[model samples]
Target: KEAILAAKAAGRSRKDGNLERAMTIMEHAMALAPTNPQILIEMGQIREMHNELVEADQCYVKALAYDPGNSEALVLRARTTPLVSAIDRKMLRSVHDLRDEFNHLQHSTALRRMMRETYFLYVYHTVAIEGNTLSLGQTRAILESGMVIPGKSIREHNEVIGMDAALRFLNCSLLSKEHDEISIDDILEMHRRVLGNADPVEAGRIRTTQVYTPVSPEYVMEQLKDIVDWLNDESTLTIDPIERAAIAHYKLVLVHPFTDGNGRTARLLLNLIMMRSGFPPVILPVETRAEYYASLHVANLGDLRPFVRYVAKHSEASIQRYIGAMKTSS
Candidate 1:
């Protein structure tokens, strides 16, 4: 009981932005209840907040050792796990099975409602990752009612509006034909909608001034052409769609084709590949922004496997969420 109280106080301290106090109190709490998974998990969170991910992961590992069945500990450990690991075959297989389960569900009102909710989250997170300041509620409000939110910039509002337009275009036209190969025009069109409202001059236009890529303005089109060809390659189509999507996304971001909306466009392209292959759209939650960029950084360093695994993990989680919603409604 004393340990629980101490941990609670530590949590309050953490919430109050008193990291030193939280760490001291949490350490004492751990000593008072060394075997307590809850205390250990709290310590792990405090450590993670302190940016000591390796130490944080160790705490979660200890917590799981004490209580293997604790889902919270399990999840925290998985989240904090180093990105330099092999893709788990079992987890991949589970994702495949979950995709099948989700696809087999009847198209009902409940299913449509669930999908609509997912759509909002997808738009919200995608734009949020690009540093859009709109809340999910505000995003939904703009998309649903076309209302202007007070105290926000027009660019912020346009970001949400443009994303909605792009997403709708993707759903209605791009994904209309599952077997159609993604083309350069299709990519440009997607970007066009993505930033037409946000930045009209740069919308749908390749970068004239170099940002990250070594390729000059003269060769941006050539690089993009090669990418589209690779995306549509017969052999490339035969590999796991998740890997294909990850590679495409990585290559696009590496090319940094457009001056603006590159990240958003790359994400849209990622989902286009996945959705074409019958997988649900993977929403990389705003909470995982750090890991998302970290994995991308790892990809830049040479190994693309970690980034692929990161995307695969999110794909699995997306399917699981859809399945969970289905089960809850039924």
Candidate 2:
């Protein structure tokens, strides 16, 4: 009865977006009743929300081992087995072609100008996604000239500056590396740059309090290490670059590692993965903010294809923008 109550409490927390608390409660439930198939299934769902697919699958498998007739566990295991296999092949090809086309114009003066403009837009949209309230022009002004907007909060202006700094760090330090290995220190440094100006005390530091509240504080580093390991894994390296980038973004955001700037950090990390693969920075426009988040919500429910496709669409658009710049210049 206690195990069931704990599972109920965890489910309530999960629905409230307090994933850390949910995980904490669920851990206790599992301890009290490790053999309960229902408890195992609930645990698996929570793990899935964190994008810990391997661990989630194991939970489902264990549940099935305990109760062979557990249909929910059976179905969930089936759904997760060929992760990334669901990404549309045609969309993947389109992204690849766009990458090639963009690469062909990589040396063009127009493309350089386009990239600069895109950088401003990238900063604007990323900050705006977090309710920064800075207009695109204002964001550009702040980034280009350090001109402070009259009515905006200092925190808002700092956000723009911090994002700009983070982007620069991503390009100069992370993206420039020959190997694609992403380290915890690298992610922390990126977060540090992201919020160093805006929220210095919390900047670059993983949150000690519950937010997500995703995996609990105790599991944050462990899960972060898991994600970094997954990123560097050979199997992950073999996936389509865009798909891999999308998954990386989803996993990081799900972890909600920092007290703040988690979204910006994840988006920056997303771009780092994409740009390292020769694709341009794919901007998730403020216009698509609703769709961007909705897609993530879907991924949390087990189907990741929508989120991957959404990212691929934006990536293709970014590449096309570069190609169009080259065309008009000629």
Q: What are the lDDT scores of the predictions, listed in order?
A: 0.80, 0.80
Error of 1 at 200 (Å): 0.3
Please provide, for model 1 over 9-91, each residue's C-alpha lDDT reduced to its tens digit, 9 standing for 90 to 100: 65756646765878777766766775677787888888887887756776776677668789999988888775313324545
- Model 2 — which ten-residue stretch has the worst lDDT? 210-219
Evaluate model 1: give its TM-score. Answer: 0.72
Task: Please list all clashing residue pairs in model 1, or write none if there are none.
Answer: none
Task: Please list the residue runs of candidate 2 whose C-alpha ends up more than 4 Å from where it truly belongs after superposition.
Answer: 1-87, 178-180, 212-217
* TM value for model 2: 0.72
Clash number for model 1? 0
Per-residue error (Å), model 2, residue 190: 0.5
- Model 1: lDDT of residue 122: 92
